[PDB]
C-alpha cells in the first residue's frame, strides 16, 4: 500500500492529482529489514 500525496496540492491548477508522490515500504538488501522508499506515480496507475 502506497501513501500517495499530490505533488502540487496548493501549488498550481485546481489541485489536480495528475502526479502523486507515493512512499512505501520495501526490503532493500536484507529480506528482514525494509526501508521506506518513494517514487512519483501517475494518477492513472494508483487505485485508492
Amino acid at each position: 500500500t502506497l501513501q500517495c500525496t499530490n505533488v502540487t496540492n496548493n501549488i498550481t491548477d485546481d489541485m489536480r492529482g495528475e502526479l502523486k508522490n507515493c512512499s512505501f515500504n520495501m526490503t532493500t538488501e536484507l529480506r528482514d529489514k525494509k526501508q521506506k522508499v518513494y517514487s512519483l506515480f501517475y494518477r492513472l496507475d494508483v487505485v485508492q
Binding site: T8, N10, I11, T12
Partner: protein, 105 residues
C-alpha cells in the same frame, strides 16, 4: 537581514537565498531607510524608467542559473537593504518578501 560588505568601484553580484523550482519572475527592491522602496528590475531583467541603466539581472533561460543581481558602478551612498521577490510556477503565491541584504562600503 544579512551581512554583505563591499567597497567603491568594483562590481558587486548579489543573489537571494530562495531557490527557484520552475520558471521564475523575480523582482528586486531597494529599501533605503526612511525613504520609500523603489523597484529596480522586474521580470528578471525589466527595469522601469528612472532606475539607472546599470543594474542588470539574470535572464530566465536554461533553468538552473541562480537569480543574482548586479549593481556594478556602486556608489558611496549605497547603504540600503535589497530584496529578492521570487515568483515561480511551482511554489505558488509568494506572500513572503524574502531576506534583506545590507549594503556596506
Amino acid at each position: 537581514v544579512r551581512p554583505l560588505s563591499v567597497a567603491l568601484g568594483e562590481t558587486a553580484r548579489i543573489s537571494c537565498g530562495r531557490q527557484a523550482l520552475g520558471s521564475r519572475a523575480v523582482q528586486w527592491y531597494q529599501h533605503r531607510p526612511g525613504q520609500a522602496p523603489i523597484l529596480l528590475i522586474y521580470n528578471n531583467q525589466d527595469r522601469p524608467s528612472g532606475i539607472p541603466e546599470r543594474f542588470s539581472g539574470t535572464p530566465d533561460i536554461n533553468f538552473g542559473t541562480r537569480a543574482t543581481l548586479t549593481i556594478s558602478g556602486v556608489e558611496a551612498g549605497d547603504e540600503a537593504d535589497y530584496y529578492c521577490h521570487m515568483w515561480d510556477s511551482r511554489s505558488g503565491f509568494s506572500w513572503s518578501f524574502g531576506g534583506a541584504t545590507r549594503l556596506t562600503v
